[PDB]
Amino acid sequence: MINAIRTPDQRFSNLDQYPFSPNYLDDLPGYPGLRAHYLDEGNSDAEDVFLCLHGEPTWSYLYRKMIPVFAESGARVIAPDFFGFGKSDKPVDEEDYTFEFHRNFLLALIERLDLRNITLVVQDWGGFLGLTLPMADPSRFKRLIIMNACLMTDPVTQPAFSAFVTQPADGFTAWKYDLVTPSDLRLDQFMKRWAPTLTEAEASAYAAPFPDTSYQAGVRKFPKMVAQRDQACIDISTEAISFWQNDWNGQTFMAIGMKDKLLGPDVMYPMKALINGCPEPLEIADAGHFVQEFGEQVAREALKHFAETE
Ligand SMILES: [Cl-]
């Protein structure tokens, strides 16, 4: 019904530091015939669930350094790949991908797996989407680990969440240009540019899911949605602000990648004030946008912060 394609299994043969077994679902209500991949690590019967959401133009591979730390603590860790990324199916038309398409997949996943006691771990798109989830079923959410992310609200309600789109020129402007313009988009080269500490191997794992451009429609659409926010996105992200500010009673841990030209400190400080009870952020000086690349440390420090309240 939704025309999609699937990456050949052989593209993931040679992955570096990703020994996690695949789990798939192809029976989600609203996504017929589409197969979603997700990792499910640690004790399946654990009380605590770490729901790890990735963003553009990545996949669960991004949390590979945090997963073992959260698992080792006794938690179950869920790390789904959005349709159009990783090992999940990829709709071939850019028009199929919208903010609700991705947000409703997550609410479906969460219901399907019956996830409870959720510690939400987000960044980038994982956070644009993920921060609008708790208000849909607040009983399932208990903690939040937030890295460089904000809400896709309208320019007037929160100028900080809109200003980065236009400036600086080597910020989101550069990001979007690198992603939606080339007719020969090489993810490994893009990642090496935006996360300069990746090895060749790690960079290659980020291109793994896309053999050619026909597999990249979701990758092309995400940056356009940051630039052109539809009405549902705006209304939903605007209502989320109220949730975080007045309804949220959980534990929060915030980590900022200080070299991020996109969602760095001028975006993170304002998010921190809207999140009720958000403590002082852990600023990682050498980290850029992809804070997970410096994940072991964020994982360790947040568990340490959350233990100190149990
Ligand atoms: Cl983006």
Q: Are strands 36-41 and 49-52 parallel, antiparallel or unpaired?
A: unpaired
Q: 32-55 burial string, b = 16+ CB within 10 Å, else e? A: eebbbbbbbbbeeebebbbbbbbb
- DSSP-derived letter for residue 172 is H
Q: For residue 147, which of 271, 64, 300, 273 has the smallest C-alpha distance?
A: 271
C-alpha span between 310 and 256 (Å, rounded): 24
Query: What does 106-159 look like in DSSP terms, one character per residue?
Result: HHHHHHHTT--SEEEEE-THHHHHHTTSGGGSGGGEEEEEEES------TTT-T
C-alpha span between 197 and 189 (Å, rounded): 12
Instruction: Answer for the pair 91, 83: CB distance below 8 angstroms, yes or no.
Output: yes
Catalytic residue among 48, 89, 124, 188: 124
Residue 283 three-state SS = strand
Question: How determined?
Answer: X-ray
260 catalytic? Reply is yes
CA of residue 149 to ligand 1 center, whole Å: 11
CA of residue 139 to ligand 1 center, whole Å: 30
Q: For residue 20, which of 75, 53, 68, 88 has the smallest C-alpha distance?
A: 68
Q: Are strands 49-52 and 118-122 parallel, antiparallel or unpaired?
A: parallel
Instruction: Give bridge partners of residue 78 from the DSSP assignment.
Output: 40, 51
Q: Is 194 annotated as a binding residue?
A: no
Instruction: Give bridge partners of residue 141 from the DSSP assignment.
Output: 118
CA of residue 280 to ligand 1 center, whole Å: 26
- CA torsion 103-15-256-159 (nearest 10°) is -40
C-alpha span between 28 and 112 (Å, rounded): 7
Look-up of token digits 């179950």: 76
Largest pairwise CA distance in the chain: 51
Using N-to-C axis directions, what is the helix angle for 187-194 and 172-180, rounded to 10°? 170
CA of residue 6 to ligand 1 center, whole Å: 22
C-alpha span between 26 and 32 (Å, rounded): 7
286 catalytic? Reply is no
C-alpha span between 246 and 195 (Å, rounded): 35
Q: How far is CA 146 from CA 246, 252, 272, 298, in A?
A: 18, 8, 10, 10
- DSSP-derived letter for residue 200 is H
Catalytic residue among 48, 81, 188, 260: 260
Which one-letter amino acid corresponds to residue 113?
Answer: L
Q: Is 125 annotated as a binding residue?
A: yes
The yes/no answer on whether domain 1-310 falls in CATH 3.60.15.10 is no
* Helix-, strand-, coil-residue percentages of the chain, each rounded to 5: 40, 15, 45
Residue 37 three-state SS = strand
CA of residue 125 to ligand 1 center, whole Å: 7
